[PDB]
């Protein structure tokens, strides 16, 4: 039992590294392979050797290179200095790499600390935590206002506990200054404003709660037809050109989440460069003041040009920062930009280990890594004495090859997630954005949300139920139109084929770059829906009551009589709610309800 | 800084099969290291160490193992990874796939040596592309406009004129002080090499064009390093000499077909249709080497041409290209049989960076709205044309006859322009507004009433 502190490489083939002379090393330990100390992680060991996936580029690594063992798993540094910043997969600050090296590259050997040890943070204690008082794992013992928006509450780590022997007075402190000291059996454990936590270890918590409050994304088809809750899991499949990112950008700018963590896992570099351009010029108003939305956003950027095995480390980092701000009592929302490029990172690592594949080349443990990632979401009562509640919403966009939803990454995702916003390609061959296909998409947060809906917007539950019958019976009859023809339709069916065309063009379509449709509040969503459903109900009353007896209404005069009312209904998407009051707009609708009652 | 030790020269080959040579007793082999085989009959071949294990080194050769002995061949280990001599004088010369001159010239005098694999740009210091390149094609500059720093392929097929519109966007490449064009040809014919070479000398552009042409009879493992050479000189011109570079990687389906044979020789895990599992990351290492950075005044734009097999956009060549790049240009077969010269079907075409590159200060106010209505009037009239072939030419609504009036006036007047005509963006938007004049003012749903009052009565 001598435990040699070094190892030596024995063979490198792509991203994996076989390292000999590595006897007492544990699985998922962090090692540093190479003279430039590339960050690695042990995934397999056979006797004296150990196999290491490397989060850097192994081009140039010779055989006799040293591999030093760190004895600790892959972990993140959690504390102040983390909002507004951008990291890569292993959490090196890209703003502090570009200013330390003064170049435009990442030198693939840099050991920069994740949080800077020179910024002074204004610590204040909890004001009810005296010396000698007991303190358990996970309670807030300090408030550091990181920005004007986020009060970064300092918490004890969930492992240890004790009694307070020293708590720091209020003032300016570094991330290395000792703030709290404890005694448990007679041992002094000192604490700073940061804590280190492994990314593959789920954060401990008191008890899980069902989700009740919805996640208002701002999009009209997403909030009305297929709603998602905060604490819920959501998948957005779709091919290229469908708008998987635009739904993710519109949800990171205008949703009702407290913080936002955006993980670009193997996607375009200019997409992570447009995020940190238009976010600090976009503000939000919470307490009468305006502050930019970059103060509540943290980025984890691992593009497709970057190393391959760091796509896995960028997912587990982005969920561990998301569970950290969960424990302060915030409502985190996490957007994994591509969980299908993470699954292609697992396939390529498994191809170097010569593992037996599952269907389509992916490893057999693919559905277990996706399950242990989406299960870490949920609205859940946090650990600690101040008794707060947090939430994590995971909206991970799947990128299936060829637009085929019978894909072992998509079919493994849909067995886990509860919401599914399936984008369609043919709804992008005509400029129909957002391109959510309303026929295959679903949301299983309906029994959880009707109690919220029967308390705030009581008319909405039969509105979306009737709108889901109009949109489905149009598809049943548009199959008849392309085969038999429009001339053989009844009058109850020609009214359906044109109120649905009013739904897909006014309600469902939403141009995010226009100032009236960049964000649709939920009174405007129900407001323009209670008009277009009742107009369908009123035009049904002009058919069934006048069935056969008199000279009846054959829908051709409803077009002629209500030629401005059909312009009053198709232009409600214009009733700007940023600069138009809610009460104004609401009144404008009920007036259009009065005009249809007078015209019918 | 510099290597000074002498080079070890092994005659210790112990295995060769396919394109892979396996040496033994190699002393500290290095991953991705370049070796220099000399055959028993005296010819030289290069190689790259693909996997080390203890004292062995699995090198694949760039020219094939035809004739490699087990006793007489000698392999010399250059102690460094593949670097190429890059210079400003690589501008006006033609080269083959490996590194060498073709136009009876000397070797490069090596301003410095750059690694061909590159290193990825920090996404914090990468700025968004904003300045729209006016390329003089109405299907591009109207509805699929490119920016300065944008990666955008030309989705083509076999036999369609994608070489011709490649040489057309080379001449008319300007802003709305010339582009230093870098051209990489891989898996091309003899006539296709002479078509691009004699066109770059016709317009006098061969003073700033670096041709990297690799023919169809050249070895298929030299097609891997051909886009890596043509993008490591393009990074030298754009990120060090502050030059605006236009990179054209023609026949990108010949690169990835040459990527399938190497991975099938290594017995790698296959993805779809035999292509390797790392095809997304290997394509993105040459597609994401584009854009402009904050400290420099240069930029690099990529227009990689590829021919999709069987006119299929769900093949792994054009499907994985759409996920990396920023929108595509789709030429069509149905618009080529009608002898329209640019057969650009605009419906599966896209420009993801056109929204930031057009507007009031960029081109003019009406650009973002007429392009959404020219796209929707084209998509409806193709649905009407798919309806009149089943129903009839006379059982249509009278509104559906304007959509047949649009498409016959769209394809011949908007996109068809001829091989030497370079319409400006103000020429295009005054041609594109004429086709919307045949519709009523309240049938144009995508254009609001404000900018309809300033442009539609004319």
């Amino acid at each position: 039992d001598k435990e040699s502190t070094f190892g030596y490489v024995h063979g490198v083939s792509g991203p994996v590294v076989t390292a000999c002379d590595m006897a007492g090393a544990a699985m998922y330990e962090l090692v540093r392979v190479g003279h430039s100390e590339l960050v690695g992680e042990i995934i397999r060991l056979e006797g004296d050797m150990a196999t290491i996936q490397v989060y850097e580029e192994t081009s140039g690594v010779s055989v006799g290179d040293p591999v030093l063992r760190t004895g600790k798993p892959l972990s993140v540094e959690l504390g102040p200095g983390i909002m507004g910043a951008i990291f890569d997969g292993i959490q090196r600050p890209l703003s502090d790499i570009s200013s330390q090296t003064q170049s435009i590259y990442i030198p693939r050997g840099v050991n920069v600390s994740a949080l800077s040890r020179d910024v002074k943070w204004d610590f204040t204690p909890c004001k009810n935590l005296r010396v000698g008082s007991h303190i358990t794992g996970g309670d807030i013992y300090g408030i550091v206002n990181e920005n004007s928006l986020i009060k970064h509450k300092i918490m004890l780590p969930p492992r240890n506990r004790g009694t307070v022997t020293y708590i720091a007075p209020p003032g300016n402190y570094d991330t290395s200054d000792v703030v709290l000291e404890l005694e448990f059996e007679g041992i002094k454990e000192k604490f700073s404003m940061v804590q280190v936590w492994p990314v593959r270890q789920v954060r401990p918590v008191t008890e899980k709660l069902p989700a009740n409050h919805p996640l208002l994304t701002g999009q009209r088809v997403l909030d009305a037809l297929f709603p998602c809750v905060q604490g819920g899991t959501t998948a957005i499949p779709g091919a290229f050109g469908c708008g998987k990112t635009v739904i993710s950008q519109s949800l990171s700018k205008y949703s009702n989440s407290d913080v936002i963590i955006y993980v670009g896992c193997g996607e375009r570099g200019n997409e992570m460069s447009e995020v940190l351009r238009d976010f600090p010029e976009l503000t939000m108003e919470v307490d009468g003041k305006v502050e930019s939305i970059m103060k509540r956003t943290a980025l984890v950027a691992n593009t497709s040009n970057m190393p391959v095995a760091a796509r896995e480390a960028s997912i587990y980092t982005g969920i561990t920062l998301s569970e950290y701000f969960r424990d302060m009592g915030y409502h985190v929302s996490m957007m994994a930009d591509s969980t299908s490029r993470w699954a292609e990172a697992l396939r390529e690592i498994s191809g170097r280990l010569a593992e037996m594949p599952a269907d389509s080349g992916y490893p057999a443990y693919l559905g277990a890594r996706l399950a242990s990632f989406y299960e870490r979401a949920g609205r859940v009562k946090c650990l600690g004495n101040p008794e707060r509640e947090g939430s994590v919403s995971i909206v991970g966009a799947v990128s299936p090859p060829g637009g085929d939803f019978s894909d072992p990454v998509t079919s493994a995702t849909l067995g886990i997630v509860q919401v599914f916003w399936g984008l369609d390609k043919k709804l992008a061959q005509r400029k129909h954005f957002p391109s959510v296909n309303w026929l295959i998409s679903y949301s299983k947060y309906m029994r959880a949300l009707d109690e919220y809906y029967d308390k705030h917007f009581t008319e909405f539950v039969p509105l979306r139920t009737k709108a889901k019958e109009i949109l489905q019976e149009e598809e049943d009859l548009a199959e008849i139109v392309q085969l038999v023809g429009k001339a053989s339709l009844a009058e109850t069916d020609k009214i359906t084929l044109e109120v649905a065309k009013l739904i897909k063009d006014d309600f469902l379509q939403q141009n995010g770059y226009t100032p009236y449709d960049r964000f649709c509040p939920f009174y405007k969503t129900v407001g323009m829906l209670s008009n277009m459903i009742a107009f369908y109900d009123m035009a049904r009353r002009a058919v069934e009551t006048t069935a056969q007896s008199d000279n009846k209404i054959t829908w051709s005069i409803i077009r002629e009589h209500m030629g401005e009312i059909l312009y009053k209904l198709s232009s409600m998407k214009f009733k700007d709610p940023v600069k138009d009051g809610e009460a104004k707009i609401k009144a404008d609708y009920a007036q259009l309800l009065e005009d249809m009652q007078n015209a019918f | 800084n510099y290597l000074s030790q002498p080079r070890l020269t092994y005659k210790t080959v112990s295995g060769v099969n396919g394109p892979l040579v396996i040496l033994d007793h190699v002393k500290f082999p290095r991953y991705a290291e370049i070796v220099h085989l000399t055959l028993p009959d005296g010819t030289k071949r290069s190689g790259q160490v693909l996997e080390v294990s203890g004292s062995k080194a699995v090198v694949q050769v760039f020219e094939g193992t035809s004739g490699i002995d087990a006793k007489k061949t000698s392999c010399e280990f250059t102690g460094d990874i593949l670097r190429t001599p890059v210079s400003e004088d690589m501008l006006g010369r033609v080269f083959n796939g490996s590194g060498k001159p073709i136009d009876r010239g000397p070797v490069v005098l090596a301003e410095d040596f750059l690694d061909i694999m590159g290193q990825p740009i920090n996404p914090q210091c990468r700025i968004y592309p904003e300045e729209m390149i006016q390329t003089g094609i109405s299907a591009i500059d109207g509805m699929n406009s490119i920016a300065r720093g944008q990666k955008i392929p030309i989705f083509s097929a076999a036999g369609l004129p994608h070489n011709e519109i490649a040489a057309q966007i080379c001449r008319q490449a300007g802003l709305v002080e010339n582009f230093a064009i870098v051209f990489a040809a891989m898996g091309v014919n003899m006539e296709t090499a002479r078509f691009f070479k004699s066109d770059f000398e016709e317009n006098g552009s061969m003073d700033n064009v670096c041709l990297f042409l690799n023919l169809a009879n050249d070895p298929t493992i030299e097609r891997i390093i051909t886009p890596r050479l043509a993008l490591t000189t393009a990074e030298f011109l754009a990120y060090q000499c502050e030059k605006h570079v236009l990179v054209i990687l023609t026949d990108m389906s010949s690169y990835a077909e040459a990527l399938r044979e190497v991975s099938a020789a290594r017995e790698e895990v296959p993805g779809r249709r035999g292509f390797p599992g790392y095809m997304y990351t290997d394509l993105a290492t040459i597609y994401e080497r584009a854009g402009r950075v904050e400290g420099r005044n240069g930029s690099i734009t990529q227009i990689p041409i590829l021919t999709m097999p069987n006119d299929d956009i769900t093949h792994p060549i054009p499907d994985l290209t759409g996920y990396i790049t920023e929108g595509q240009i789709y030429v069509d077969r149905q618009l080529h049989n009608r002898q329209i010269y640019p057969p650009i079907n605009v419906l599966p075409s896209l420009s993801r960076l056109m929204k930031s590159a057009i507007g009031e200060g960029m081109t003019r106010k009406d650009h973002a709205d007429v392009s959404n209505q020219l796209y929707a009037c084209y998509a409806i009239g193709k649905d009407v044309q798919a309806m009149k072939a089943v129903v009839g030419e006379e059982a249509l609504t009278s509104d559906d006859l304007l959509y047949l009036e649009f498409l016959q006036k769209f394809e011949r007047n908007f996109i068809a322009q001829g091989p030497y005509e370079n319409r400006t963006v103000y020429e295009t938007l005054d041609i594109g507004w004429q086709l919307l004049r045949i519709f009523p003012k309240e049938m144009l749903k995508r254009i609001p009433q404000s900018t309809l009052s300033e442009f539609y009565p004319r």
Partner: peptide, 19 residues
């Protein structure tokens, strides 16, 4: 085809040890 050629490469290695 890839799963069967993976096994015939593994069965050859185990038959190279027992020599």
């Amino acid at each position: 085809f890839y799963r069967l050629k993976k096994i015939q490469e593994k069965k050859k290695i185990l038959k190279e040890k027992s020599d």
